[PDB]
Nucleic acid binder design. Structure first.
Ligand SMILES: [Mg+2]
Ligand SMILES: [Mg+2]
Ligand SMILES: [Mg+2]
Ligand SMILES: [Mg+2]
Lengths: 110, 68, 174
RNA sequence: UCCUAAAGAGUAACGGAGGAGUACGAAGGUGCGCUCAGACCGGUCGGAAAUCGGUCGCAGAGUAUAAAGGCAAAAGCGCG
RNA sequence: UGCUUGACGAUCAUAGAGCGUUGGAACCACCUGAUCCCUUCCCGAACUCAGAAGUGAAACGACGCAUCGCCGAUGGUAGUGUGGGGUCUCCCCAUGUGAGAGUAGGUCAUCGUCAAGCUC
RNA sequence: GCCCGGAUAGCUCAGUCGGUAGAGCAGGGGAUUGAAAAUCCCCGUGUCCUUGGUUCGAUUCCGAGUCCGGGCACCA
RNA sequence: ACGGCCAGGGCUACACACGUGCUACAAUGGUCGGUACAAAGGGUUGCCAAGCCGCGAGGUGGAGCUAAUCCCAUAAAACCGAUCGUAGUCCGGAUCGCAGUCUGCAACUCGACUGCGUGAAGUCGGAAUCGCUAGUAAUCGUGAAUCAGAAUGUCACGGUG
């Protein structure tokens, strides 16, 4: 609603845009360089005039509500095909090829 | 309508980023602009598009030519 | 005011659209009831007033707290007697609150579709659910607590739900 | 309180089944207003179910308390 | 010596439930905004108020249409008072009485007082 | 035959005045230790004997049905 | 055939417990922009510069070079200025999705890196238990052996201390 999702205040522009869930740290710097908003100033100090430009920039990369949909569809493409990469993904084993004998604990919990 | 029960319900102006001024009677008692309205939302503007489904065929031809 | 748009445009159009006989047979919106469900935090005695205050501002009308009529042991005990908060809005408030919908509360669902057209009653009453309480004028984000289950239940003078669809698509927000 | 008790009362058995040795300062009095249970459709984290809207209802709910007999002049529910 | 409609009743499914066409001449709600009374465990729909700018269908009003419900014969049977019997935990005879259920089929009820409209 | 008490983790015992199940042993994992025990730290466990009701809700309240104990089964 | 040759697969599986090692949990710190000093070693079947195109890993290019000559090769910590204000965060990087480069006939099982997005557990860690008495512990780099490619282990030497 503020930019697609609620944004924190009393913080710099680049850090504030990092919470948009689809723009990280480097792409946030590129958005600020293109628009002209100075990261040194807080989002509170900014005017309500260029935030439309910030929203336009957000509307050209992705929004979280569709990014999660499309990344889930990308996962589904592997999960419905028979590939080993999805075969381990459903069971919850490491996917990229990490060792499963020990310490594959992030994908299996305590 | 009971007198001393309801809040103050006055008239204010809702101005979107595109400039669509809407006269709305609310409890706001002040005008506040909005970032997006019914005329600017992508779904009602027709700009929502689709999730693009899947394009591996396309991708492979874009990636690898494979003459013959 | 949506009443002026309805009387001038929708009312004469729907008569010839739906092959109705005379002027007053056209469907019209009967009432709007919100019914913010305060089921969570039964034995609190602290969130009822917060929900009442939150719903008071977005409607311009004091709600009424709703008690229970039974006791689901799986749900909760009767000790937390107040469970619900309800509001009713007729034409003076209905057409003015309905302006928030379809004009500025369409950026309120954070959605792919405005509202599914397959959700209707057998007689033609429409219902919808609002996930978040952030979506309204004159509401803070820091001072507001994000625990507000709000519905928007619509009543229409329709014999069947196709008349309800035909009425809704005028002030369309699907 | 019901049956045994035989269509007025009454009627026994170490005969078959259940409860009481209280509660209410409003759970009483008056005026004014309102429907119950249950089924289905829809409605965001609830879901067979919580709170809401609509229809079908036509007392199958409820009675402060065990069962019997009654309760739309509601004997049930709310407000001054 | 008519039809329409309002009020209160006789009697409570042979009086009920369901299925069309309709009434502008008064009612019937609906409606403008709820200002003046009054009202909302929040609502001008409940309740109230200035009528009729509007409306005749949702709503109701009676007015069509016998599927369901209800009514229900005759006859027989069960039961039974009195008296006498048998093969006497049950039944029969003489006499008197006599159900319930089932079995052709009717019905969109039948009436009382007041008030108003249609013609004048 | 009649009457009183009890049924709780793998095993022994608390418990409720209905909304909730703990103590010890035992068990699992880790430390000790050359190794096993005893020391030490952490942890999972009952569907409260079965059934029918009372209730919004039963291990708890009520009536029955099994099993284990304790009293009596007397005057001839 | 318990001897041989060739394809794939396997030794990198996976509710679990153990040893070693690297990251962290931050403000004696995280980023941005300037600026200073090393040792040791490897390179004519090799090092592979400058210019050049790429967000980057890199691609072209071919010099000089058989070594105080040329390359690997910019050492980093520190110091100077700005911001962050201790917040599960300009901490933390695991995980996963998409897109590539290099090596190799061949990167699915099963490699190493680069670009974008995601952002977890983790707030200094029980009984216990280990290394260290001086350039010692602590912490930060550099280059090499094995090697087509592939290091948190390991080969070797240095900063502050
Ligand atoms: Mg009697
Ligand atoms: Mg008698
Ligand atoms: Mg009473
Ligand atoms: Mg190598």
């Amino acid at each position: 609603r503020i930019a697609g999702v609620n944004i924190p205040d009393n913080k710099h522009t680049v850090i504030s845009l990092t919470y948009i869930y689809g723009v990280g740290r480097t792409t946030a710097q590129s958005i600020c360089a293109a628009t002209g908003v100075n990261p040194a100033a807080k989002i509170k100090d900014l005017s309500d005039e260029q935030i439309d430009q910030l929203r336009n920039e957000v509307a050209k990369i992705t929004t979280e509500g569709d990014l999660r949909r499309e990344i889930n569809m990308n996962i589904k493409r592997l999960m419905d095909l028979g590939c080993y990469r999805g075969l381990r993904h459903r069971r919850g084993l490491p996917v990229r090829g990490q060792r499963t004998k020990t310490n594959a604990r992030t994908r299996k919990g305590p | 309508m009971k007198a001393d029960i309801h809040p103050t319900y006055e008239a204010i102006e809702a101005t979107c980023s595109c400039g669509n001024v809407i006269k709305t009677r609310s409890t706001l008692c002040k005008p506040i602009h909005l970032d997006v309205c019914s005329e600017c939302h992508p779904f009602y503007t027709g700009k929502q598009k689709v999730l693009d489904t899947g394009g591996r065929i396309d991708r492979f031809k874009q990636r690898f030519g494979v003459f013959g | 005011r949506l009443k002026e748009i309805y009387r001038k445009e929708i009312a004469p159009k729907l008569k010839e659209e739906l092959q109705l006989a005379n002027v007053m047979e056209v469907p019209r919106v009967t009432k709007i009831t919100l019914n913010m469900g305060l089921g969570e935090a039964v034995g609190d005695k602290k969130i009822i007033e917060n929900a009442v205050a939150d719903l008071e501002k977005i409607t311009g009308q004091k709600p009424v707290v709703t008690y229970a009529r039974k006791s689901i042991a799986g749900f909760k005990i009767r000790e937390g007697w107040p469970i619900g908060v309800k509001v009713t809005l007729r034409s003076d408030r209905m057409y003015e609150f309905l302006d928030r919908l379809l004009s500025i509360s369409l950026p309120r669902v954070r959605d792919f579709r405005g509202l599914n057209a397959k959700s209707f009653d057998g007689r033609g009453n429409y219902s919808m659910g609002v996930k978040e309480q952030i979506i309204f004028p004159e509401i803070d984000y820091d001072k507001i607590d994000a625990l507000r289950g709000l519905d928007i239940t619509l009543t229409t003078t329709a014999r069947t739900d196709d008349e309800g669809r035909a009425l809704l698509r005028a002030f369309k927000f699907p």
